[PDB]
Amino acid sequence: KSKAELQSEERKRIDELIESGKEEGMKIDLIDGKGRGVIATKQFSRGDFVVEYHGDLIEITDAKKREALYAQDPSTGCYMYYFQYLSKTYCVDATRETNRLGRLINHSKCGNCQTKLHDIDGVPHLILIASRDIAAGEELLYDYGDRSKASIEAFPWLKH
């Protein structure tokens, strides 16, 4: 198959996974010093679609607003994910507690999952794809991105 045929087959598999909302081969577990963490129940190959970073979609401050009220109450964890979806800050605020698993994935700079923008007829979709072969039992992790001095001062685990 060509490069275009493989990309179309990879896009059709990603579109079906985003539509069904299936989060198979993944279960919640209590990580030591991280609250909730996502761990693999089956072997995920390199390049395989893991799970969508699902939540409430909106504009730039259209996610950074519940920020200024979620700072007013520290208990609700930081679950906002900003992104540049075609020149405009388009995000997915997963602050509300749901059964979706993408919002519970922990941080690691050298983890086993990369965050990418997956467009489906105009509507942006944050997806988590396996950067390498993820072993069964191991924790699913991805680079959170916020390497700023204010954020790293409050929780030092963002650095590593």
Partner 1 sequence: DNIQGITKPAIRRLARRGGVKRISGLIYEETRGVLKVFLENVIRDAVTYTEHAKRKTVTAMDVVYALKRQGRTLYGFG
Partner DNA sequence: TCGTAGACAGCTCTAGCACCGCTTAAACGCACGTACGCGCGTCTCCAGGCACGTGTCAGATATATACATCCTG
Partner DNA sequence: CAGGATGTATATATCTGACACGTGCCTGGAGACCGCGTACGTGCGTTTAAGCGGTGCTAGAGCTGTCTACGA
Annotated binding site: 34-36, 79, 106-107
Binding residues for S-adenosyl-L-methionine: 34-36, 79, 106-107
Q: In angstroms, what is the minimal distance from the CB of 65 to partner 1?
A: 8
Q: Using CB under 7 A, list all residues that contact DNA.
A: 58-69, 71-72, 93, 148-151
Q: Is 90 in the site for partner 1 (CB under 8 A)?
A: yes
Closest CA to 114 of 34, 39, 51: 51
Q: Left if phi > 0, otherwise alpha if psi is -120 to 50, otherwise beta: which for 137?
A: left
15 or 56: whose CB is closer to DNA?
A: 56
What CA–CA distance (Å, rounded) separates 160 from 112?
A: 14
Binding-site member from 31, 67, 76, 89 for partner 1 (CB under 8 A): 89
Neighbours of 1 (CB within 10 A): 8
For residue 146, CA distances in Å to 12, 43, 133 come to 31, 29, 25
Judged by DSSP in three states, 150 sits in helix
Q: Is 61 in the site for partner 1 (CB under 8 A)?
A: yes
31 or 58: whose CB is closer to partner 1?
A: 58
64 or 100: whose CB is closer to partner 1?
A: 64
